[PDB]
Amino acid sequence: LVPIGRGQRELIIGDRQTGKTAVAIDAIIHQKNCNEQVPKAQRVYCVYVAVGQKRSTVAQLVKLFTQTGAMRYTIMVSATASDAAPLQFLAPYSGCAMAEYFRDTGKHGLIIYDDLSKQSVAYRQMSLLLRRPPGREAFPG
Amino acid sequence: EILVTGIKVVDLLAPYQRGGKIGLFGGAGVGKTVLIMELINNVAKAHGGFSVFAGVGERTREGNDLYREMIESGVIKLGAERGNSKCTLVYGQMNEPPGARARVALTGLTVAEYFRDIEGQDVLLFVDNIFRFTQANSEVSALLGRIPSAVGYQPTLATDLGGLQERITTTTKGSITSVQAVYVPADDLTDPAPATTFAHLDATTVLSRSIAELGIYPAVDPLDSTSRMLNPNVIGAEHYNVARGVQKVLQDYKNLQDIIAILGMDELSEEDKLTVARARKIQRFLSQPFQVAEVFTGTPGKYVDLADTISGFQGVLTGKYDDLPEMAFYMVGDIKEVKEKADKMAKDIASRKEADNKKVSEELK
Amino acid sequence: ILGMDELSEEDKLTVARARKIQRFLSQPFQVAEVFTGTPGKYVDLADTISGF
Amino acid sequence: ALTGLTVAEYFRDIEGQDVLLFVDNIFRFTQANSEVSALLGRIPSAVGYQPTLATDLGGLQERITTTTKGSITSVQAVYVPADDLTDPAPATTFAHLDATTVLSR
Amino acid sequence: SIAELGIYPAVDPLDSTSRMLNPNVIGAEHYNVARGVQKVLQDYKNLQDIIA
Amino acid sequence: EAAAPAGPKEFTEVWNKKAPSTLIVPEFPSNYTAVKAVGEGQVHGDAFPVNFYTPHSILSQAQKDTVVLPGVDGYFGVKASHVPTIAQLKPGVVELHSGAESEKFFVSGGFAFVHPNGVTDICVLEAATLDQVDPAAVKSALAAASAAQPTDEFEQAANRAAIELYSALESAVEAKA
Amino acid sequence: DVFYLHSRLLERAAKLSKELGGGSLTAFPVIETQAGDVSAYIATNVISITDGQIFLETELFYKGIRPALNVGLSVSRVGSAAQFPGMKQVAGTLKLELAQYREVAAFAQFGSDLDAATQYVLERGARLTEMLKQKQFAPIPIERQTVAVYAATKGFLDKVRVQDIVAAEEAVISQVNPAVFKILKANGKITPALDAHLKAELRKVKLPGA
Amino acid sequence: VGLSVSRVGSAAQFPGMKQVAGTLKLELAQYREVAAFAQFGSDLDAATQYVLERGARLTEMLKQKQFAPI
Amino acid sequence: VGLSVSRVGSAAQFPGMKQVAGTLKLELAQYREVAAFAQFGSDLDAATQYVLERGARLTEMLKQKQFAPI
Amino acid sequence: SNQAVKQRIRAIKNIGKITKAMKMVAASKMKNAQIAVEQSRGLVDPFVRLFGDFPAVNSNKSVVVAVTSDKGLCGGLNSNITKYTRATLATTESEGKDVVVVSIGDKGRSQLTRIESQRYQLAIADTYKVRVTFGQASLIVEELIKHNPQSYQILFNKFRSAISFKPTVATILSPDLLEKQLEDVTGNSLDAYDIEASHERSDVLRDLTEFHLGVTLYNAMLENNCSEHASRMSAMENSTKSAGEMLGKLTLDYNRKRQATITTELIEIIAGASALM
Ligand SMILES: Nc1ncnc2c1ncn2[C@@H]1O[C@H](COP(=O)(O)OP(=O)(O)OP(=O)(O)O)[C@@H](O)[C@H]1O
């Protein structure tokens, strides 16, 4: 129904506990299933950016990825909820810089910014505590 | 690993993990203290380890009530037999200033963290209203000189709540089974303080105001409560399929809710009037009498085992109880007790016409 | 939607009382007799209670 | 409205009479005080009214009373904004009203 | 709403406006078929609620 | 022999035992019928109650003293206590009498019962009084009827009904008294 | 801190221990809602502070039912242990009969139809409703309340029409001899010696109408 | 399905799925077209009842489990 | 028509229009309250169908082309 | 957000207007189709005065007719008749007999072909499309004596009042099969009548029971049509009061969200201005 492409940014939007992380995980697991099959340059290297999630969920996700063998191609950037708000703000950029290595060197990357609705709350925390004037829902400009 | 609580809507539709964070979301008078006292009654007795109760910004009446009901239960022993006590109370109740309510959850967590890390134990951490932690930081941050974020909360809401909630974990050397009550501030689940703490929980048990206005207690919303244990690879497919079937029937009745209002049930399809009657049955069958609610209702409590709920909810789904009335399912434990209430409703419509009771010759007795 | 003919005799007696009750709530004012001719009435409370 | 209350308060407190006071649109009194407190730099309360809405209304409505020498009765035209009786300006004004005369078309 | 019916381009025929839609500008024959299409579409938009 | 007595009283017990007990027992047209046949009465002398009926209208429900009905064996008068009969009617004029004055409805067919309690029941599908018929149409309609005779004898049954009704109507319009 | 404003005020209404004199303090905060909305900020604040509630409905109040207590939404679970016994005996079947009366709400023959077998609970819940109506500035002693609701809920006012239960219950209070009120207040419960003399006193009174 | 869009559409999916998926995308639009006309039960001329099972079979075809990509 | 007011009102209109428009706004109000029945097949009691056709020709009476005042 | 509840208020408001129009449409249709019902009530009683009322007969082939309505906003009428249809159809089936079930009105065919599809041979709709007339009931009755049953049970709603619609069962016995036999007591009860017809009584009773089936079928669909309009007049009344209670609740919810929106937008503006001032 909604087919992705190879350089496409596709938003997984929904309410809580509807299966957004699940769609992203099936994308990463399917890329492990197809990387063992294609000649060396159609292989997709995944990056999971886990912003704002609890550390138990990231442990469950690393357990799942390593028991299915998908951790061989996956990087996981994990700025959890107890981390400082600049680490949660900066972890999508860290993960994108890790996954841009494969884009810049002829390979193919795939990145999931899981809970990008939490990077904005961490950025709002930083900008309100740096005394920058708030806006819509007190988010920065 | 699953933690059976003996509550039907909790066991079936959002089962509790034995070492995970558990939230009870409620809206001021829907029953999340009675639910947490029933979880203390059903869980903390069969648990062999230690319990901590962090009372964060709740009634001091309830703190004295829990203390006295724990002394007469033998869970707290006074004086010389104090070493055999199983529970630690930490109380920062709603008369305390906001600096005390904002740090008393950390006190309860520290007492539980000692038993987790040092003693190697399994701990239960009940926190009554973890919302009042957030609210107390919101009270003190108006004077700390910060620019406020959305609805009026501090700009550091999520990192405050996350730095508190990331300490309540099962580690490699101990487990904290934490049941937290969360207050939603104006029956608003989109308020930032409930919406922030949805992310740190394994099982959310969202209690509804309208379900309580129906009279169905505990007022757990079956289509707003979730769990990471509702998965066939942990609870088995026979439990998972009946839970997803019950949720499917309750959603397919919720989709008819305004057609039934503005037109009535008179015009619905006969494959959908079956759906409405079955869902009116399985939403009375989630009702359950509690052992802690028997003091103000009088009906005794019903602990229901898990296999009883799974078999009793297969039966209403397949159609094995389409002849029993709706009210036969209300406030009963098992599907067995539906049958002894269905026929007791049919004695008492026939016992109206049996006798004419008069009392004679007792003025000299 | 039905008609006054199908009404009960007590469901026409309330109509016959209520029409003259809402007519008896009307009153000609003293400040309108400048340009409407009918003189104005000041009704006491004792007359009002008995007359209703 | 306070000027009108003063001219009525003479006839109450000095003449010893039963005075009427017609405050035409008590809502426009509320709205004018909302504008005044917005110009003085104060933070608005709920929907946009003054924080002092209850006490600015109660400064007017509490001098309209019966004392030992006379009384002031007050027939106040009430505007209800957005057909909303729970709007805080008619919700505050209705707390002081002792009667209600609805004129219908 | 037009695009959820699969009709592309999803131009709202009512909510679109032009300064050229004037009988002195594009001609009265064009103007009347435009106003007639908008008339029948507004009538159907008002009838959908009693159809359902 | 009546050892199997069907009825409204004897449907109720088999219904109360077989059908569900939520429902009240379904009504019957006997419950809405105030006057009957076998139970006597309704004459009190020279009067007898005549109920002249059509599916669209109730033409008379008063009491009369004689009615003359166009039976298949010819006309016949029904006085206050006739013998009980079930008389099939042919097209003709039903005439009511209450005394000196009479009303004459021309009918198209039907039956006519008089019951052992003296109540009579005239049951016809269409009864138009003689003022409502114009004679210029019945002559041309009989001319168009007594002319075309198809061999399909269903249509000749309809033709026989046509010429019977139209002929009795034509004799019914020169028969003014 | 508008929650703390009310919480630090209402927490001072306590029942002290026996080491502290045994004194108490009962609080009745009053909260005005707008259009019956109890999901307001302050209303949900004080609901989550106070022990019970007394919801007063505008629909019942403008239907003549005064005190207009919403009997389903109103709770008090702390003072339910501290009830007058005897009143606790009859109030159970009182609010159970009113509870199954609230299942006959807006569809007696308003909603779709009538079954007319539950006319007993309809014309019983009406008499229990007009039993609980009460005028202003006249509070009733508890022993005369439990006698009145005993006469209501045991069926001793079952023959009286709905229009004069206000007169029927004051006739019950004025006509039943005032010894039984002293027995009921001193014993504090409807003792097995007392229900017999109560039921003997309740059949020999002339209730108006009928 | 009605609210989830994609900008590339074709030219960036499987060609064999491109043969068999346009007739699924439009047929689910037909199936959603009749869901607001399924509360009465008139069942017009075996069309609004035929796609009422055909699209209902397609939406059941699109369901799948978790952690098990195909 | 129902939401457009003029608080000056009839004191400042054409006196030849004032005795004709007082009927017009009244029967336009009558047409506005009976406005659902225009879309019906079952005709009602012809005290409503009369005001339906009358109000329809009255709303078509008040139409006017642009830049051509009367 | 705050636009969906506004258009939802508009939708409920127009639904309330629609159902208040349909209520008085059904009121007009009940007020005119009531005199036809009282006029057709006369002809059914000479036959039940002559032949009587024998519901509990033992037959071997029986045609049961459920007279339903065509349009589907009747509010609990056609479901009531398909309850009573099988409630009397199981009452009189204990002999191992044949049963043909017929429905008048396609809301009977939507409700009877799932509850007795083994016995359902006929579905007759569009009967009320203009009006019901006696020739129409005659054609339907001829389709009923296409089969040759021993009895006819007719299920319809008698228009008792504008609020009460008593569901009745009317029974017609076949002439040579049960009509002469259910009158036999001490001889026969029909022998008191002197037949003044052309042929023998086995044809007079044939004509009379065909007439009696047609007459009670005419009155059946006519009474049921009047009660269908009178129950639609009450169902649309309940629909207006339900869509008025829903509008009155949703307007309060809109006013709450309106006040909340003005407050939170103003708090956003003040918070953005206090950071700079
Ligand atoms: N295809 C599926 N089939 C069955 N169950 C599923 C499917 N996808 C997800 N789930 C279940 O739904 C629940 C929510 O899934 P997931 O965590 O992916 O959603 P989410 O939106 O990321 O939630 P959160 O916002 O809490 O992170 C999980 O418990 C998962 O077991």
Ligand SMILES: Nc1ncnc2c1ncn2[C@@H]1O[C@H](COP(=O)(O)OP(=O)(O)O)[C@@H](O)[C@H]1O
């Ligand atoms: N399981 C239950 N059974 C019966 N009544 C209940 C139940 N849960 C809640 N209630 C009612 O709802 C009220 C809510 O009490 P509480 O749990 O203290 O609310 P909160 O959610 O504010 O802590 C109780 O007084 C009780 O009367």
Ligand SMILES: [Mg+2]
């Ligand atoms: Mg997620």
Ligand SMILES: [Mg+2]
């Ligand atoms: Mg609490």
